[PDB]
Amino acid sequence: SMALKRIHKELNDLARDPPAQCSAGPVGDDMFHWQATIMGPNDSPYQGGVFFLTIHFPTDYPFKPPKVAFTTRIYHPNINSNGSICLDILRSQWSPALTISKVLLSICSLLCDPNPDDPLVPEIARIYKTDREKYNRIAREWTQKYAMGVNADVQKLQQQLQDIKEQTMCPVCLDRLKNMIFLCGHGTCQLCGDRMSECPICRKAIERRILLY
Amino acid sequence: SMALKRIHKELNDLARDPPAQCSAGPVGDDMFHWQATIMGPNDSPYQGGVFFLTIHFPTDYPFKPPKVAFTTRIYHPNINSNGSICLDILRSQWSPALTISKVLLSICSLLCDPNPDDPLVPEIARIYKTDREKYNRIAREWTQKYAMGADVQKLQQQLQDIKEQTMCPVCLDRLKNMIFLCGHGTCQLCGDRMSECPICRKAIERRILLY
Ligand SMILES: [Zn+2]
Ligand SMILES: [Zn+2]
Ligand SMILES: [Zn+2]
Numbered sequence: 001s002m003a004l005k006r007i008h009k010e011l012n013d014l015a016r017d018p019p020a021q022c023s024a025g026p027v028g029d030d031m032f033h034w035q036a037t038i039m040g041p042n043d044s045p046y047q048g049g050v051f052f053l054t055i056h057f058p059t060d061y062p063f064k065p066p067k068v069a070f071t072t073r074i075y076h077p078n079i080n081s082n083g084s085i086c087l088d089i090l091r092s093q094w095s096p097a098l099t100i101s102k103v104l105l106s107i108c109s110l111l112c113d114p115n116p117d118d119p120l121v122p123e124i125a126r127i128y129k130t131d132r133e134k135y136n137r138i139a140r141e142w143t144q145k146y147a148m149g150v151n152a153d154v155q156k157l158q159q160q161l162q163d164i165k166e167q168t169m170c171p172v173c174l175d176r177l178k179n180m181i182f183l184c185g186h187g188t189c190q191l192c193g194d195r196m197s198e199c200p201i202c203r204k205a206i207e208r209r210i211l212l213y
Numbered sequence: 214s215m216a217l218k219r220i221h222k223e224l225n226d227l228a229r230d231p232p233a234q235c236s237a238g239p240v241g242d243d244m245f246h247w248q249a250t251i252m253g254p255n256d257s258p259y260q261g262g263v264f265f266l267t268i269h270f271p272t273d274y275p276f277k278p279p280k281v282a283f284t285t286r287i288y289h290p291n292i293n294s295n296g297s298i299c300l301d302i303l304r305s306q307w308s309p310a311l312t313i314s315k316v317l318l319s320i321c322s323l324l325c326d327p328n329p330d331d332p333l334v335p336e337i338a339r340i341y342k343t344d345r346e347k348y349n350r351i352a353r354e355w356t357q358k359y360a361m362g363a364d365v366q367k368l369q370q371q372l373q374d375i376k377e378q379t380m381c382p383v384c385l386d387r388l389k390n391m392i393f394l395c396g397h398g399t400c401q402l403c404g405d406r407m408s409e410c411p412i413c414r415k416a417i418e419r420r421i422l423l424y
């Protein structure tokens with residue numbers, strides 16, 4: 001299915017282009033259920049901690065966002081005691097062009113820059129807004145408590161094929177070439193583009209779909 | 214210049230996969246003046262002959278067609294005694310996405326299938342339509358008179374024909390970052406210099422830039 005192909009694609013890109021700190025992959029034979037790992041961002045009060053997350057891909061991913069939750073306790077205004085995450089990318093601001101990699105980076109950014117005006121734990125948002133120093137101390141204490149313990153020419157042809165693909169491939173499936181363009185200047189393949197009403201890159205509504213030949 | 218880059222690119226591509234029926238290249242150091250040779254196709258009464266042509270590239274090639282003419286006399290309804298060729302590919306159906314190789318192949322095709330539609334030599338066209346056997350005899354006689362003087366990893370080079378689908382068809386150098394409503398596209402530099410699509414020829418209604 002489109003969802004399963006896209007999940008395999010993201011897995012291969014994560015393996016050939018690993019993130020330095022984060023990590024994510026299938027737990028067993030179920031490609032639609034992943035485990036992820038995030039290291040506490042170095043300039044944050046979570047530095048030194050390792051946080052696990054569960055990911056669940058819907059059957060019609062990536063047109064629908066994945067379900068992401070923490071399983072490691074963490075002291076944060078936008079993450080509750082069940083590990084739910086309040087992150088726009090995961091609900092309203094989901095785009096079919098985003099990947100698990102980007103989602104993990106956005107979670108690390110959320111850990112660095114909380115949104116206390118949309119809390120999941122009001123008392124933590126209140127501390128963050130009133131006493132940043134105390135918020136940092138407590139977030140560190142919680143981190144310590146729960147989150148610790150003949151070839152040159154082939155390599156030139158491949159680099160050329162790869163940098164042409166990066167600029168011309170559909171951003172939703174990463175599989176076919178963009179043969180359908182919207183008036184906003186962005187495009188997809190026909191297959192992914194017929195399943196959307198707004199552009200996956202700038203989110204403007206699709207006024208018109210012009211097919212390429 | 215754009216014309217000179219495109220001429221060198223076409224010359225290199227004529228080197229990596231030369232056309233079997235034709236041959237063409239600079240006469241000396243003049244890149245804008247070539248000599249060409251086409252062999253009389255076995256499909257026509259010109260079979261056995263070798264015909265010479267001159268090629269003239271305008272300074273703003275390929276947005277204007279090259280001027281191609283025979284220097285070898287030939288008996289044909291669409292080629293007159295000055296060596297001029299009546300072939301829409303050279304004027305009305307010219308596209309800047311076309312190359313000298315396509316043109317020479319179209320000229321060999323014209324030698325195979327003359328057009329008595331609006332010919333350049335009415336009397337020869339009349340003979341062609343009236344006494345094809347006599348047309349063939351005279352064409353053969355004129356031919357006789359004037360015209361007889363690794364791969365295991367190269368899958369990638371094959372895969373790289375993806376360039377054909379993504380590169381500008383005018384310059385063959387940049388990528389297609391501008392789209393017309395007909396569905397075809399060019400780079401912005403080539404596209405802004407055209408009023409018709411280089412692939413399907415519909416008038417360019419609108420140019421949409423890609424990102
Ligand atoms: Zn697609
Ligand atoms: Zn857009
Ligand atoms: Zn000249």
Ligand SMILES: [Zn+2]
Pocket residue numbers: 381382383384385386387399400401402403404
């Ligand atoms: Zn171009």
Ligand SMILES: [Zn+2]
Pocket residue numbers: 393395396397410411412413414415
């Ligand atoms: Zn067109």
